[PDB]
Ligand binder design. Structure first.
Ligand SMILES: [Cu+2]
Length: 229
């Protein structure tokens, strides 16, 4: 239970909900066929389009509720420790990031922090240790212009049952300058890219003594591999 609700650009805080299409509650999306998978449940929208340069260091901030912790010493801020899983980021090129319909876009993955089997560390573990932030660079080669930037937490604490993996998604509206001429060889659809039977979605992450360590096995994130310039 958490909401992606703020972006930073090379460390500069763009402000709460600035440029975001974000849900207004922290409940998960669980039906991978839902249009809610694209940018989360329909919630707040913003007219701002965040100016970024290709290659920039982007931060995406999750907190338990809109605005931060739900109450003093909230143990589930930025997200409950139990919610082990990967974090993924995708781009979709759009003409106008403020007015584009979220439906039917052509998505490609640019980054993910999944599971390190030898350290037993999930992307959500790093999110927690970075106080809700996940950091990644925009590719240096992507073309100039508007994009939606979709960031997604996949929490697997209940994912051993069909349709009970939990998704926490929002989209940021950005304009890229200083880019290159990259065109993705392949794109995917949301909804569509994920199937409930995917081995990173229908998964029992619990080991011998009940710890969520994936039995020290490698984990396969759903969707396509991140592009590289
Ligand atoms: Cu939760």
């Amino acid at each position: 239970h958490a909401i992606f609700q703020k972006v930073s650009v090379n460390g500069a805080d763009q402000g709460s909900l600035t440029g975001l299409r974000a849900p207004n509650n922290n409940n998960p999306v669980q039906n991978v066929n839902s249009q809610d998978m694209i940018c989360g449940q329909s919630g707040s929208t913003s007219n701002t389009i965040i100016e970024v340069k290709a290659g920039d260091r982007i931060g995406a901030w999750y907190q338990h509720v809109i605005g931060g912790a739900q109450f003093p010493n909230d143990p589930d801020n930025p997200i409950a420790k139990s919610h082990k899983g990967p974090v993924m980021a995708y781009l979709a090129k759009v003409d106008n990031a403020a007015t584009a319909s979220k439906t039917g876009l052509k998505w490609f993955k640019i980054w993910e922090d999944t599971f390190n089997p030898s350290t037993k560390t999930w992307g959500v573990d790093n999110l927690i240790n970075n106080n809700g932030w996940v950091y990644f660079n925009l590719p240096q080669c992507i073309a100039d212009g508007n994009y939606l930037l979709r960031v997604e937490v996949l929490a697997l604490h209940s994912a051993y049952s069909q349709g009970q993996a939990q998704f926490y998604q929002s989209c940021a509206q950005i304009n890229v300058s200083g880019g290159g001429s990259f065109t993705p060889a392949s794109t995917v659809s949301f909804p569509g890219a994920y199937s409930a039977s995917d081995p990173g979605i229908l998964i029992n992450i619990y080991g011998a003594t009940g710890q969520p360590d994936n039995n020290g096995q490698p984990y396969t994130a759903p969707g396509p591999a991140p592009i590289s310039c």
